[PDB]
Amino acid sequence: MGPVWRKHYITYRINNYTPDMNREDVDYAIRKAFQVWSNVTPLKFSKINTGMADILVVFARGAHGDDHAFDGKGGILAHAFGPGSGIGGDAHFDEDEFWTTHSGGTNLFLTAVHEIGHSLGLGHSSDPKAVMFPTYKYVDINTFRLSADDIRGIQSLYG
Ligand SMILES: C[C@H](NC(=O)[C@H](C)NC(=O)[C@H](Cc1cc(-c2ccc(-c3cccc(Cl)c3)cc2)no1)CP(=O)(O)c1ccc(Br)cc1)C(N)=O
Numbered sequence: 001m002g003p004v005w006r007k008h009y010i011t012y013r014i015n016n017y018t019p020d021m022n023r024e025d026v027d028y029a030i031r032k033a034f035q036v037w038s039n040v041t042p043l044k045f046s047k048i049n050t051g052m053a054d055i056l057v058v059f060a061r062g063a064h065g066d067d068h069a070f071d072g073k074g075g076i077l078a079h080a081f082g083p084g085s086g087i088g089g090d091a092h093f094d095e096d097e098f099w100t101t102h103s104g105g106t107n108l109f110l111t112a113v114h115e116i117g118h119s120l121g122l123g124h125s126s127d128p129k130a131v132m133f134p135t136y137k138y139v140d141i142n143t144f145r146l147s148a149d150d151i152r153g154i155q156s157l158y159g
């Protein structure tokens with residue numbers, strides 16, 4: 001078992017906002033992404049406007065202070081650190097992507113669901129239906145659902 005959060009009550013804060021999207025749409029996408037995971041675990045997520053949060057959400061480009069530089073438009077879209085103090089848990093989104101609420105560019109919600117999975121301690125799945133599959137694909141946001149494998153995975157960590 002890799003690292004897990006030692007509590008079910010987990011805080012997050014959005015450090016900064018991509019200019020690609022309306023600020024309220026970023027808030028909404030991130031909120032719903034956390035909700036996807038809270039819906040299948042005992043985890044509860046609380047948004048922090050100011051102060052110390054377990055999970056910091058950052059938009060940045062290229063080399064941005066963590067020895068894992070982003071790569072311009074395309075390729076890697078985002079990355080996240082597993083549960084832990086400091087940078088542990090934090091989710092970073094490559095500002096060189098074009099973030100959207102829809103099928104165009106890269107959908108922030110779907111990407112955030114995947115990254116938050118990492119923030120909670122999940123690794124990848126080989127199931128092409130799993131949100132934790134390694135490569136992004138757009139899927140109909142309304143019909144979006146975690147796969148049985150995603151659920152097995154996260155319930156193995158928290159219950
Ligand atoms: C352009 C696009 N790029 C990608 O997908 C790239 C490769 N992947 C990455 O950018 C990953 C980040 C990433 C993956 C996803 C994703 C995956 C699957 C689905 C999905 C799939 C099927 C069904 C359903 Cl319902 C959903 C949705 C989103 N969203 O973000 C990077 P990472 O966080 O894994 C990472 C970074 C650094 C290290 Br070190 C380790 C891990 C592509 N090639 O398709």
Ligand SMILES: [Ca+2]
Pocket residue numbers: 070071072073074075076077094096097
């Ligand atoms: Ca990139």
Ligand SMILES: [Ca+2]
Pocket residue numbers: 053054055056084085086087088089090
């Ligand atoms: Ca952190």
Ligand SMILES: [Ca+2]
Pocket residue numbers: 018019020094095096097098099
């Ligand atoms: Ca951008």
Ligand SMILES: [Zn+2]
Pocket residue numbers: 064066068079092
């Ligand atoms: Zn980073």
Ligand SMILES: [Zn+2]
Pocket residue numbers: 114118124132133134
């Ligand atoms: Zn991943």
